[PDB]
Coordinates of C-alpha atoms (C1' of nucleotides) in Angstrom, one line a residue:
Chain A
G1 CA 0.0 0.0 0.0
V2 CA 3.0 2.2 -0.5
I3 CA 3.2 5.5 -2.2
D4 CA 6.3 6.1 -4.4
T5 CA 8.5 8.5 -2.5
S6 CA 11.4 8.1 -5.0
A7 CA 10.9 11.6 -6.1
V8 CA 11.6 12.9 -2.6
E9 CA 15.3 12.0 -2.3
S10 CA 15.9 13.0 -5.9
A11 CA 14.5 16.4 -5.1
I12 CA 16.1 17.3 -1.8
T13 CA 19.5 15.8 -2.1
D14 CA 19.7 18.2 -5.0
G15 CA 18.2 20.7 -2.6
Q16 CA 20.9 20.3 0.1
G17 CA 23.5 20.3 -2.6
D18 CA 22.4 23.8 -3.3
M19 CA 22.6 25.0 0.3
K20 CA 26.3 24.2 0.2
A21 CA 26.7 26.3 -2.9
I22 CA 25.3 29.5 -1.4
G23 CA 27.1 28.9 1.9
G24 CA 30.5 29.1 0.1
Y25 CA 29.3 32.3 -1.5
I26 CA 28.9 34.0 1.8
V27 CA 32.2 32.8 3.3
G28 CA 33.9 34.5 0.4
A29 CA 32.2 37.8 1.4
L30 CA 32.8 37.6 5.1
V31 CA 36.6 37.4 4.7
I32 CA 36.5 40.8 3.1
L33 CA 35.5 42.3 6.4
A34 CA 38.0 40.1 8.2
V35 CA 41.0 41.2 6.1
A36 CA 40.0 44.8 6.1
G37 CA 39.4 44.7 9.8
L38 CA 43.0 44.2 10.7
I39 CA 44.8 46.1 8.0
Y40 CA 43.0 49.0 9.5
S41 CA 44.7 48.2 12.7
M42 CA 48.1 48.4 11.1
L43 CA 47.5 51.9 9.9
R44 CA 46.2 53.1 13.2
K45 CA 49.1 51.8 15.3
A46 CA 51.7 53.3 13.0
Chain B
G1 CA -28.4 -18.2 -5.3
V2 CA -25.4 -16.1 -5.9
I3 CA -25.0 -12.8 -7.8
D4 CA -21.9 -12.5 -9.9
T5 CA -19.7 -9.9 -8.1
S6 CA -16.8 -10.6 -10.5
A7 CA -17.2 -7.1 -11.9
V8 CA -16.5 -5.7 -8.4
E9 CA -12.8 -6.6 -7.9
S10 CA -12.1 -5.8 -11.5
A11 CA -13.5 -2.4 -11.0
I12 CA -12.0 -1.2 -7.7
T13 CA -8.6 -2.8 -7.8
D14 CA -8.3 -0.6 -10.9
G15 CA -9.8 2.0 -8.7
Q16 CA -7.2 1.7 -5.9
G17 CA -4.5 1.6 -8.5
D18 CA -5.5 5.1 -9.4
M19 CA -5.5 6.5 -5.9
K20 CA -1.8 5.6 -5.9
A21 CA -1.2 7.5 -9.1
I22 CA -2.6 10.8 -7.8
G23 CA -0.9 10.4 -4.5
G24 CA 2.5 10.5 -6.1
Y25 CA 1.5 13.6 -8.0
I26 CA 0.9 15.4 -4.7
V27 CA 4.2 14.3 -3.1
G28 CA 6.0 15.8 -6.1
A29 CA 4.3 19.1 -5.3
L30 CA 4.9 19.2 -1.6
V31 CA 8.6 18.8 -1.9
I32 CA 8.6 22.2 -3.7
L33 CA 7.6 23.9 -0.5
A34 CA 10.0 21.8 1.5
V35 CA 13.1 22.7 -0.6
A36 CA 12.2 26.3 -0.9
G37 CA 11.4 26.4 2.8
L38 CA 15.0 25.9 3.9
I39 CA 16.9 27.7 1.1
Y40 CA 15.1 30.7 2.4
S41 CA 16.7 30.0 5.7
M42 CA 20.2 30.1 4.2
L43 CA 19.6 33.5 2.7
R44 CA 18.3 35.0 5.9
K45 CA 21.1 33.7 8.1
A46 CA 23.7 35.1 5.8
Chain C
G1 CA -15.1 0.4 -14.0
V2 CA -12.4 3.1 -14.1
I3 CA -12.9 6.8 -14.2
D4 CA -10.7 8.8 -16.6
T5 CA -8.1 10.6 -14.4
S6 CA -6.1 11.7 -17.4
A7 CA -7.2 15.3 -16.7
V8 CA -5.4 15.1 -13.3
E9 CA -1.8 14.8 -14.3
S10 CA -2.3 17.2 -17.1
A11 CA -3.6 19.7 -14.5
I12 CA -1.2 19.5 -11.7
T13 CA 2.1 18.9 -13.5
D14 CA 1.3 22.2 -14.9
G15 CA 0.4 23.2 -11.4
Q16 CA 3.8 22.2 -9.9
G17 CA 5.5 23.8 -12.8
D18 CA 4.1 27.1 -11.6
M19 CA 5.2 26.6 -8.0
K20 CA 8.8 26.6 -9.4
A21 CA 8.1 29.9 -11.2
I22 CA 7.1 31.8 -8.1
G23 CA 9.8 30.3 -6.0
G24 CA 12.5 31.8 -8.2
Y25 CA 10.7 35.1 -8.0
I26 CA 11.2 35.1 -4.2
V27 CA 14.9 34.1 -4.3
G28 CA 15.5 37.1 -6.5
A29 CA 14.1 39.3 -3.7
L30 CA 15.8 37.7 -0.7
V31 CA 19.3 38.4 -2.2
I32 CA 18.5 42.1 -2.0
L33 CA 18.5 41.9 1.8
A34 CA 21.5 39.6 1.7
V35 CA 23.7 42.0 -0.3
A36 CA 22.5 45.1 1.5
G37 CA 23.0 43.2 4.8
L38 CA 26.8 43.1 4.5
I39 CA 27.6 46.2 2.6
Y40 CA 26.2 47.9 5.6
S41 CA 28.8 46.1 7.6
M42 CA 31.6 47.6 5.5
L43 CA 30.4 51.2 6.2
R44 CA 30.1 50.6 9.9
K45 CA 33.6 49.1 10.3
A46 CA 35.2 51.9 8.4
Chain D
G1 CA -18.1 -12.1 11.5
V2 CA -14.6 -10.6 11.0
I3 CA -13.3 -8.6 8.1
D4 CA -9.7 -9.4 7.1
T5 CA -7.6 -6.4 8.2
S6 CA -4.4 -8.2 7.3
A7 CA -3.8 -5.7 4.5
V8 CA -3.7 -2.9 7.1
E9 CA -0.5 -3.7 9.0
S10 CA 1.2 -4.7 5.8
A11 CA 0.3 -1.3 4.3
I12 CA 1.1 1.1 7.1
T13 CA 4.2 -0.5 8.7
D14 CA 5.6 0.1 5.3
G15 CA 4.1 3.5 5.6
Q16 CA 5.8 4.4 8.9
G17 CA 9.0 2.9 7.5
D18 CA 8.9 5.7 4.9
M19 CA 8.3 8.5 7.4
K20 CA 11.7 7.6 8.9
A21 CA 13.3 7.8 5.5
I22 CA 12.2 11.4 4.8
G23 CA 13.0 12.4 8.4
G24 CA 16.7 11.6 7.9
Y25 CA 16.7 13.5 4.7
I26 CA 15.7 16.7 6.6
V27 CA 18.2 16.3 9.4
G28 CA 20.9 16.1 6.7
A29 CA 19.8 19.5 5.5
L30 CA 19.4 21.2 8.9
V31 CA 23.0 20.6 9.8
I32 CA 24.0 22.8 6.9
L33 CA 22.6 25.8 8.6
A34 CA 24.0 24.7 11.9
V35 CA 27.6 24.4 10.7
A36 CA 27.4 27.6 8.6
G37 CA 25.8 29.3 11.6
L38 CA 28.9 29.2 13.7
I39 CA 31.7 29.4 11.2
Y40 CA 30.2 32.8 10.5
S41 CA 30.8 33.6 14.1
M42 CA 34.5 32.8 13.8
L43 CA 35.0 35.2 10.9
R44 CA 33.1 38.0 12.7
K45 CA 35.1 37.7 16.0
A46 CA 38.4 37.8 14.1
Chain E
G1 CA -34.2 3.9 -22.0
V2 CA -31.8 6.7 -21.6
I3 CA -32.4 10.2 -20.2
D4 CA -30.7 13.1 -22.1
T5 CA -27.9 14.3 -19.9
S6 CA -26.5 16.5 -22.7
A7 CA -27.5 19.5 -20.5
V8 CA -25.1 18.3 -17.8
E9 CA -21.7 18.8 -19.4
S10 CA -22.9 22.0 -21.0
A11 CA -23.7 23.3 -17.6
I12 CA -20.8 22.3 -15.5
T13 CA -17.9 22.7 -17.9
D14 CA -19.1 26.3 -17.9
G15 CA -19.2 25.8 -14.2
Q16 CA -15.6 24.7 -13.8
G17 CA -14.6 27.4 -16.2
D18 CA -15.8 29.9 -13.6
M19 CA -14.0 28.4 -10.7
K20 CA -10.8 29.2 -12.6
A21 CA -11.9 32.8 -13.0
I22 CA -12.3 33.4 -9.3
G23 CA -9.1 31.5 -8.4
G24 CA -7.0 34.0 -10.4
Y25 CA -8.8 36.8 -8.6
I26 CA -7.6 35.5 -5.2
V27 CA -4.0 35.0 -6.3
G28 CA -3.9 38.6 -7.4
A29 CA -4.8 39.5 -3.8
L30 CA -2.4 37.2 -2.0
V31 CA 0.6 38.6 -3.7
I32 CA -0.2 42.0 -2.0
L33 CA 0.6 40.5 1.4
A34 CA 3.6 38.7 0.0
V35 CA 5.3 41.8 -1.5
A36 CA 4.4 43.9 1.5
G37 CA 5.6 41.2 3.8
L38 CA 9.2 41.5 2.8
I39 CA 9.6 45.2 2.0
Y40 CA 8.7 45.6 5.7
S41 CA 11.8 43.5 6.4
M42 CA 14.0 45.8 4.4
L43 CA 12.9 48.8 6.5
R44 CA 13.4 47.0 9.8
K45 CA 16.9 45.7 9.0
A46 CA 18.1 49.2 8.0
Chain F
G1 CA -26.8 26.5 -15.9
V2 CA -24.6 29.2 -14.7
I3 CA -24.8 31.3 -11.5
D4 CA -24.1 35.0 -11.9
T5 CA -20.7 35.6 -10.3
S6 CA -20.6 39.2 -11.5
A7 CA -20.9 40.4 -7.9
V8 CA -17.6 38.6 -7.1
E9 CA -15.1 40.6 -9.0
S10 CA -17.0 43.8 -8.2
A11 CA -16.6 42.9 -4.5
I12 CA -13.0 41.8 -4.2
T13 CA -11.2 44.0 -6.7
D14 CA -12.5 46.7 -4.4
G15 CA -11.3 44.5 -1.6
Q16 CA -7.7 44.2 -2.9
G17 CA -7.8 47.9 -3.7
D18 CA -8.2 48.4 0.1
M19 CA -5.3 46.1 1.1
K20 CA -3.0 48.5 -0.8
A21 CA -4.4 51.4 1.2
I22 CA -3.5 50.0 4.5
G23 CA -0.2 48.7 3.3
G24 CA 1.0 52.3 2.6
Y25 CA -0.2 53.3 6.0
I26 CA 2.2 50.9 7.6
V27 CA 5.2 51.8 5.5
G28 CA 4.7 55.4 6.6
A29 CA 5.1 54.2 10.2
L30 CA 8.1 51.9 9.7
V31 CA 10.3 54.7 8.4
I32 CA 9.9 56.4 11.7
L33 CA 11.9 53.7 13.4
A34 CA 14.3 53.6 10.4
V35 CA 15.2 57.3 10.6
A36 CA 15.3 57.4 14.4
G37 CA 17.4 54.2 14.3
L38 CA 20.4 55.9 12.7
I39 CA 20.3 59.4 14.0
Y40 CA 20.8 57.7 17.4
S41 CA 24.0 56.4 15.9
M42 CA 25.2 59.9 15.1
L43 CA 24.8 61.0 18.7
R44 CA 26.5 58.0 20.1
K45 CA 29.6 58.2 17.9
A46 CA 30.1 61.8 18.7
Chain G
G1 CA -46.8 25.8 -9.9
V2 CA -44.4 28.2 -8.2
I3 CA -43.9 28.8 -4.5
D4 CA -43.5 32.4 -3.4
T5 CA -39.8 32.9 -2.5
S6 CA -40.2 36.6 -2.1
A7 CA -39.6 36.2 1.6
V8 CA -36.1 34.8 0.8
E9 CA -34.3 37.8 -0.6
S10 CA -36.0 40.1 1.9
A11 CA -34.6 37.9 4.6
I12 CA -31.0 37.3 3.6
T13 CA -30.1 40.6 2.0
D14 CA -30.9 42.0 5.4
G15 CA -28.8 39.0 6.6
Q16 CA -25.7 39.8 4.5
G17 CA -26.1 43.5 5.5
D18 CA -25.5 42.4 9.0
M19 CA -22.4 40.4 8.3
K20 CA -20.8 43.6 7.1
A21 CA -21.8 45.3 10.4
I22 CA -19.9 42.8 12.6
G23 CA -17.0 42.7 10.2
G24 CA -16.3 46.4 10.8
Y25 CA -16.5 45.8 14.5
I26 CA -13.6 43.3 14.4
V27 CA -11.4 45.5 12.2
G28 CA -11.7 48.2 14.8
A29 CA -10.3 45.7 17.3
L30 CA -7.5 44.3 15.3
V31 CA -5.9 47.7 14.8
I32 CA -5.4 47.9 18.5
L33 CA -2.9 45.1 18.4
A34 CA -1.4 46.6 15.2
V35 CA -0.7 50.0 16.7
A36 CA 0.5 48.6 20.0
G37 CA 2.6 46.1 18.2
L38 CA 5.0 48.7 16.8
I39 CA 5.1 51.3 19.5
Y40 CA 6.5 48.6 21.6
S41 CA 9.3 48.4 19.0
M42 CA 10.1 52.1 19.5
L43 CA 10.6 51.6 23.2
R44 CA 12.8 48.6 22.8
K45 CA 15.1 50.1 20.2
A46 CA 15.6 53.2 22.3
Chain H
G1 CA -35.8 36.7 9.0
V2 CA -33.2 38.4 11.0
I3 CA -31.5 37.3 14.2
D4 CA -31.0 39.9 16.9
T5 CA -27.3 40.7 16.9
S6 CA -27.7 43.6 19.3
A7 CA -25.8 41.6 21.9
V8 CA -22.8 41.6 19.7
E9 CA -21.7 45.2 19.6
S10 CA -22.6 45.6 23.2
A11 CA -20.2 42.7 24.0
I12 CA -17.2 43.5 21.9
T13 CA -17.0 47.3 22.1
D14 CA -16.7 46.6 25.7
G15 CA -14.2 44.0 24.7
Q16 CA -12.0 46.3 22.6
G17 CA -12.3 48.9 25.4
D18 CA -10.5 46.4 27.5
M19 CA -7.6 45.8 25.1
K20 CA -6.8 49.4 25.4
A21 CA -6.6 49.1 29.2
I22 CA -4.0 46.3 29.2
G23 CA -2.0 48.0 26.4
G24 CA -1.4 51.0 28.6
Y25 CA -0.3 48.7 31.4
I26 CA 2.5 47.3 29.3
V27 CA 3.7 50.7 28.0
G28 CA 4.2 51.6 31.7
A29 CA 6.5 48.6 32.1
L30 CA 8.5 49.0 28.9
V31 CA 9.7 52.5 29.9
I32 CA 11.4 51.0 32.9
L33 CA 13.8 49.3 30.7
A34 CA 14.1 52.3 28.5
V35 CA 15.1 54.7 31.3
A36 CA 17.4 52.2 33.0
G37 CA 18.9 51.4 29.6
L38 CA 20.5 54.8 29.2
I39 CA 21.3 55.8 32.8
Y40 CA 23.5 52.8 32.7
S41 CA 25.3 54.5 29.8
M42 CA 26.0 57.5 31.9
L43 CA 27.8 55.5 34.6
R44 CA 29.9 53.6 32.0
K45 CA 31.1 56.6 30.1
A46 CA 32.1 58.4 33.4
Chain I
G1 CA -48.9 23.5 18.2
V2 CA -45.9 24.7 20.1
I3 CA -43.3 22.7 22.0
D4 CA -42.2 24.2 25.3
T5 CA -38.7 25.4 24.8
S6 CA -38.6 27.1 28.2
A7 CA -36.0 24.6 29.3
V8 CA -33.6 25.9 26.6
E9 CA -32.8 29.4 27.8
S10 CA -32.7 28.1 31.3
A11 CA -30.1 25.6 30.3
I12 CA -27.7 27.6 28.1
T13 CA -27.8 31.0 29.7
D14 CA -26.4 29.0 32.6
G15 CA -24.1 27.5 30.0
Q16 CA -22.8 30.8 28.7
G17 CA -22.4 32.0 32.2
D18 CA -19.9 29.1 32.6
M19 CA -17.8 30.0 29.6
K20 CA -17.1 33.3 31.2
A21 CA -15.9 31.5 34.3
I22 CA -13.3 29.4 32.6
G23 CA -12.2 32.4 30.4
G24 CA -11.1 34.3 33.4
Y25 CA -9.2 31.3 34.7
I26 CA -7.0 31.3 31.6
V27 CA -6.3 35.1 31.6
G28 CA -5.0 34.6 35.1
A29 CA -2.5 32.1 33.7
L30 CA -1.4 34.0 30.6
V31 CA -0.2 37.0 32.6
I32 CA 2.3 34.7 34.3
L33 CA 4.1 34.4 31.0
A34 CA 3.7 38.0 30.3
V35 CA 5.3 39.3 33.5
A36 CA 8.0 36.7 33.4
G37 CA 8.6 37.5 29.8
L38 CA 9.9 41.0 30.5
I39 CA 11.6 40.7 33.8
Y40 CA 13.8 38.3 32.0
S41 CA 14.6 41.2 29.7
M42 CA 15.8 43.3 32.7
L43 CA 18.3 40.7 33.8
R44 CA 19.7 40.3 30.3
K45 CA 20.2 44.0 29.6
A46 CA 22.0 44.5 32.9
Chain J
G1 CA -28.7 21.6 31.7
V2 CA -25.3 22.3 33.1
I3 CA -22.2 20.2 32.9
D4 CA -20.1 20.0 36.0
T5 CA -17.0 22.1 35.4
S6 CA -15.8 21.9 39.0
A7 CA -12.9 19.7 37.8
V8 CA -11.6 22.6 35.7
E9 CA -10.6 25.2 38.3
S10 CA -9.3 22.4 40.5
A11 CA -7.0 21.4 37.6
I12 CA -5.7 24.6 36.2
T13 CA -5.3 26.7 39.4
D14 CA -2.9 23.9 40.3
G15 CA -1.6 24.3 36.8
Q16 CA -0.9 28.0 37.1
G17 CA 0.6 27.4 40.5
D18 CA 3.2 25.3 38.7
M19 CA 4.1 27.9 36.1
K20 CA 5.2 30.1 39.0
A21 CA 7.5 27.3 40.3
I22 CA 9.4 27.0 37.0
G23 CA 9.6 30.7 36.6
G24 CA 11.6 31.1 39.8
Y25 CA 13.9 28.3 38.6
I26 CA 14.9 30.4 35.6
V27 CA 15.4 33.6 37.4
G28 CA 17.9 31.8 39.6
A29 CA 19.8 30.9 36.5
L30 CA 19.7 34.3 34.8
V31 CA 21.4 36.0 37.7
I32 CA 24.4 33.8 37.1
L33 CA 25.1 35.6 33.8
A34 CA 24.3 38.9 35.3
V35 CA 26.8 38.7 38.2
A36 CA 29.5 37.1 36.0
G37 CA 28.8 39.8 33.4
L38 CA 30.1 42.6 35.5
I39 CA 32.8 41.0 37.5
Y40 CA 34.4 40.4 34.1
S41 CA 34.3 44.2 33.7
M42 CA 36.3 44.7 36.9
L43 CA 39.1 42.5 35.7
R44 CA 39.3 44.1 32.3
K45 CA 39.4 47.7 33.6
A46 CA 42.2 46.9 36.1
Chain K
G1 CA -34.9 1.8 29.6
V2 CA -31.3 2.4 30.3
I3 CA -28.3 1.2 28.4
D4 CA -25.3 0.1 30.6
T5 CA -22.7 2.8 30.2
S6 CA -20.5 1.2 32.9
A7 CA -17.9 0.3 30.3
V8 CA -17.5 4.0 29.5
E9 CA -15.9 5.4 32.6
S10 CA -13.8 2.2 32.9
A11 CA -12.5 2.9 29.4
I12 CA -11.7 6.6 29.4
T13 CA -10.5 7.2 33.0
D14 CA -7.9 4.7 31.9
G15 CA -7.7 6.8 28.8
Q16 CA -7.1 10.1 30.6
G17 CA -4.6 8.3 32.9
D18 CA -2.6 7.7 29.7
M19 CA -2.6 11.3 28.5
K20 CA -0.8 12.2 31.7
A21 CA 1.8 9.6 31.0
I22 CA 2.8 11.0 27.6
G23 CA 2.6 14.6 28.9
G24 CA 5.4 13.9 31.4
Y25 CA 7.4 12.3 28.6
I26 CA 7.4 15.6 26.7
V27 CA 8.3 17.8 29.6
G28 CA 11.4 15.7 30.1
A29 CA 12.4 16.5 26.5
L30 CA 11.6 20.3 26.6
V31 CA 14.0 20.9 29.5
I32 CA 16.8 19.7 27.3
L33 CA 16.4 22.7 25.1
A34 CA 15.9 24.9 28.1
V35 CA 19.2 24.0 29.8
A36 CA 21.1 24.0 26.6
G37 CA 19.6 27.3 25.7
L38 CA 21.3 29.2 28.5
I39 CA 24.6 27.4 28.9
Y40 CA 25.1 28.6 25.3
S41 CA 24.7 32.1 26.7
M42 CA 27.5 31.5 29.2
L43 CA 30.0 30.6 26.5
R44 CA 29.1 33.5 24.3
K45 CA 29.4 36.1 27.0
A46 CA 32.8 34.8 28.1
Chain L
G1 CA -10.8 0.3 26.2
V2 CA -7.1 1.3 26.2
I3 CA -4.7 1.6 23.3
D4 CA -1.2 0.2 23.9
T5 CA 1.0 3.3 24.2
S6 CA 4.0 1.2 25.3
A7 CA 5.7 2.0 22.0
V8 CA 5.6 5.7 22.9
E9 CA 8.0 5.9 25.9
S10 CA 10.3 3.4 24.2
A11 CA 10.5 5.7 21.2
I12 CA 11.0 9.1 22.7
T13 CA 13.1 8.3 25.7
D14 CA 15.5 7.1 23.0
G15 CA 14.6 10.4 21.3
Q16 CA 15.5 12.6 24.2
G17 CA 18.6 10.6 24.8
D18 CA 19.7 11.7 21.3
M19 CA 19.0 15.4 22.0
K20 CA 21.7 15.2 24.7
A21 CA 24.1 13.7 22.2
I22 CA 23.9 16.6 19.8
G23 CA 24.0 19.1 22.5
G24 CA 27.4 18.1 23.7
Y25 CA 28.6 18.2 20.1
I26 CA 27.8 21.9 20.0
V27 CA 29.4 22.8 23.3
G28 CA 32.6 21.3 22.0
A29 CA 32.4 23.8 19.1
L30 CA 31.5 26.9 21.0
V31 CA 34.5 26.7 23.3
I32 CA 36.6 27.1 20.1
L33 CA 35.4 30.7 19.8
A34 CA 35.7 31.2 23.5
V35 CA 39.4 30.3 23.7
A36 CA 40.3 32.0 20.5
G37 CA 38.3 35.1 21.7
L38 CA 40.7 35.8 24.6
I39 CA 44.0 34.7 23.3
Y40 CA 43.4 37.4 20.6
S41 CA 43.2 39.8 23.5
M42 CA 46.6 38.8 24.8
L43 CA 48.3 39.6 21.4
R44 CA 46.6 42.9 21.1
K45 CA 47.5 44.2 24.6
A46 CA 51.1 43.2 24.1
Chain M
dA1 C1' 23.9 47.7 21.7
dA2 C1' 28.2 45.6 25.0
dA3 C1' 33.8 43.5 23.2
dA4 C1' 36.5 46.2 18.7
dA5 C1' 36.5 51.8 18.4
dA6 C1' 37.2 56.9 22.7

DNA sequence: AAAAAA
C-alpha cells in the first residue's frame, strides 16, 4: 500500500547540494571584512 | 443463489491503483515547498 | 469500472511547474536583503 | 463475522518505515545551517 | 431507456470554467501580502 | 446552468484595492523607526 | 406551480447586510494590536 | 428573518475597550527598561 | 402546536455563564508568561 | 442543563501554581550571567 | 430503559490516565532545550 | 478500552537521549570561539 | 547595543 517517494530524495539531495553552494558564496564575502578589519589596525598603530 | 460480483474486484482494484497515481502527483508538489522552505533560511542567516 | 483521471496529471504537473516559477521570484528578492546586509557592515567598520 | 484487516498492517508498517526515510533527509539539511551558523561567528570575531 | 444528460456537461464545464476565474482573482490579492511582507523586512533591518 | 458571479469581481477588486491602502499606512510608520534608528547612531559616535 | 420565494431575498439581503456590520466591529479591534505592536518596538530600540 | 445581533456590539465594544486598558499597562512597564537602559550608559562613560 | 422550549434558555444562559468563568481562569494564567517575559529582559540587559 | 466544570478550576489553578514554580527556577539561572557579566568588567578595567 | 454505560468510565478514566503519562514524557524533553539554551549564553558572554 | 502506548516511551526516551548527544557536540564547538576570543586579547594588549 | 572603536 506504499506511495512512491522516490521523487523525494531525488529532489532534496539536489536541494541540500544547493545550500552548500550559497554557503560558500557567503564565506567569500565575510573574509572581506576580516582582512580589512585588521589592516586598518596596522595603519592606526603606525 | 449467488449474484456475480466478479465485476467488483475488476472495477475497484483498478480504482485503488488510481489512488496511488494521484498520491505520487501530490508528493511531487509538496517537496517544492520543502526545498524552498529551507533555502530561504540560508539567505536569511547570511 | 475506471474513471478517466487523465485530466489530473495534465492539470497538476502544470500546477507544480508554476510553483517553481514563483519560487524563483522570491529568491531574487531575498538576495536584496543579503547583499545590503553586508555592505552595511563595510560602512560601519570603516 | 470478522473482516480481514491483514492488509492494514502490511500497508502502514511500510508507511511508517517511509516516514523515517524522509526524516533523515531533513536532518541532513538542517545541519548545513548549523555548521554555517557558527563558522560565520569565527569570521566576525576575528 | 436513456435520459438526455446533454444539458449536464454543457452546464458544469461552464461551471468549472468559472472556478478558474475566481481563483485567479484571489492569487492577485495574496501577492499583495507577499510583497508587503518582505519590504517591511528591508525597513526593519536598515 | 450558470450562477451569476458578477458580484464577485466587483466585490474583491474593491477588496484588494483596500489592502493597498492599509499597506501604505504601515510603510509610513516603519520609516519612523528607520530614521530614528540611525540618528541615534550619530549622537553615540560623537 | 411556483412557491413564493419573495420572503427569501427580503430575509437574507438583510442578513448579509448584518455580516458587514460585525466585520467592521472586528477590524476596529485588530488595529489595537497593530498599533501597540509597533510602538513597543520604538521603546525597545531606544 | 433576522436574528438579533444587538448583543454583539454591546459585548465586543466593551471587549475592545479592555484591550486598550491592558495596552497602557504594558507601556508603563517598557519605559522602565528604557530609562534604565540609558542611565547605565552615563555610569559607564564616566 | 408549540413545544415548550422554556428549558432551553434556562439551560444555556447558565451554559454561557460558565464559559465566562473558565475564560477568566485562563487570563490569570497567561499573565504569568507576560510578567516573566519582561523581567527576563531586565536581567539580560543588565 | 449544566455540565459540572468543577474539575476545571481544580485542575488549572494547580496548573498556574506550577508555572510560578518553574519561573523562579529560571530567574535563579539568569542572575548567574548577570553577576558574571560585570565582574568580568572589573578584571578588564584593572 | 437504560443502556449500561459502565464500560464508558472504565475505558476513558484509563484513557485520561494515559494522557498524563505522555505529557510527562514531553516535559522531560523540553527541558533539554531549556538547559542547553542558557549554557550557550554563558559561553558566548565569556 | 485502552490503546497500547507502550511504543511511545520506548520511542521518545530514546529520542531525548539523542538530543543530549547533539547538545554536547555543539558545546565542543562553542569553546573554540571562547578560547580564541581571549588569546586574541593577549596579542593585542602586548 | 556591549567586546572592537574613545
